[PDB]
């Protein structure tokens, strides 16, 4: 019904994987923006979104939410820049860091490299081996991790240590896990849209990483898409 907004995931939703958006797709969205407002959200940073969607990305969408909406543009103008250290405070930042440093120092492994802690605007990415390891070194860690459950245990330990502090944990891939404030997934971006009068907020993306929370969130009407051809097919069905 009513005034409405379409929000799209960027890679695989609007583009072919690792490819820039198509002229055909782009023309399609600008034609859609005639009747309904459009925005984009993704885990990547602004430079990445530009590569994928074009340098003029902010003139092309009514909202643009790099880094899950921790960076936000509305109507072409930079709305907010939020980061983990401002939300959590420095002392907590540093207590998390200090704990993870000392814990990693105690884990027995076949190899250790560097970038044990990667600091991002939205998360601490932590790797017992270190993110700089080579492919063969990562595979070795990953098989050890499967047998030993090194990441699961670190995360459990941390979850105990930092109970009450409003942090979520997330293991994936082969060598690291993420620590970030609660709700700092794609759901973050909804705070920027939910007071602009939309009667419906459509979300187009993957419904599954598990589960993408924005997809299942009570504010959105989530539609899972398999490719830009699909996004178009469903937009044709819903709109027009």
Angle at 88 between CA 83 and CA 89, to 5 degrees: 100
Known binder of ligand: residue 11? yes
> How far apart, in whole angstroms, are the C-alpha atoms of residue 47 and residue 50?
5
215 has binding-site annotation: yes
List the catalytic residue out of 11, 62, 145, 185: 11
Residue 9 annotated as binding?
yes
Q: Is 224 among the annotated ligand-binding positions?
A: no
| 115 annotated ligand binder | no
DSSP for residue 20? P
Closest CA to 228 of 28, 49, 58: 28
Contact (CB, 8 A) for 9 and 232? no
Q: Can 9 be counted among the known catalytic residues?
A: yes
**Catalytic site residue from 9, 62, 145, 185:** 9
Measured distance CA(128)–CA(214) in Å, rounded: 30
120 annotated as ligand-binding: yes
Determine whether the annotation assigns residue 220 to a binding site: yes
Annotated ligand binding at 18? The verdict is yes
Backbone angles phi, psi at 72, to 5 degrees: -140, 135
Q: Is 45 a catalytic residue?
A: no
DSSP conformation letters of 190-236: GGGTTTS--SEEEEEE-S-----HHHH-TTEEEEE-SSHHHHHHHHH
Residue 72 host element (H or E): strand 71-74
**Known binding positions:** 9, 11, 18, 120, 131, 138, 176, 178, 206, 215, 217, 220
**Known binding positions for alpha-D-mannose 1-phosphate:** 18, 120, 131, 138, 176, 178
Residues involved in catalysis: 9, 11
**Known binding positions for Mg(2+):** 9, 11, 206, 215, 217, 220
């Amino acid at each position: 019904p009513g005034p409405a907004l379409c929000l799209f995931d960027v890679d695989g939703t609007l583009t072919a994987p690792r490819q820039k958006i198509t002229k055909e797709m782009d023309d399609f969205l600008q034609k859609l923006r005639q009747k309904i407002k459009i925005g984009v959200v993704g885990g990547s940073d602004f430079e990445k979104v530009q590569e994928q969607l074009g340098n003029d990305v902010v003139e092309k969408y009514d909202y643009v939410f790099p880094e899950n909406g921790l960076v936000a543009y509305k109507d072409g103008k930079l709305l907010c820049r939020q980061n983990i250290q401002s939300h959590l405070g420095e002392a907590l930042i540093q207590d998390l860091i200090n704990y993870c440093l000392s814990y990693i120092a105690k884990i027995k492994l076949p190899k250790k490299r560097g970038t044990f802690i990667e600091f991002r605007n939205g998360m601490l990415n932590v790797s017992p081996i270190g993110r700089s390891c080579s492919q063969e070194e990562r595979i070795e860690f990953y098989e050890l991790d499967k047998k030993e459950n090194i990441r699961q245990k670190f995360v459990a330990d941390l979850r105990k240590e930092f109970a009450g502090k409003g942090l979520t944990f997330s293991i994936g891939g082969q060598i690291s896990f993420d620590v970030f404030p609660d709700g700092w997934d794609k759901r973050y971006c909804l705070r920027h849209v939910e007071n602009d009068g939309y009667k419906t907020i459509y979300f187009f993306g993957d419904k599954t990483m598990n589960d993408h929370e924005i997809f299942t969130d009570p504010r959105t009407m989530g539609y899972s898409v398999t490719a830009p051809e699909d996004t178009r097919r469903i937009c044709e069905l819903l709109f027009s």
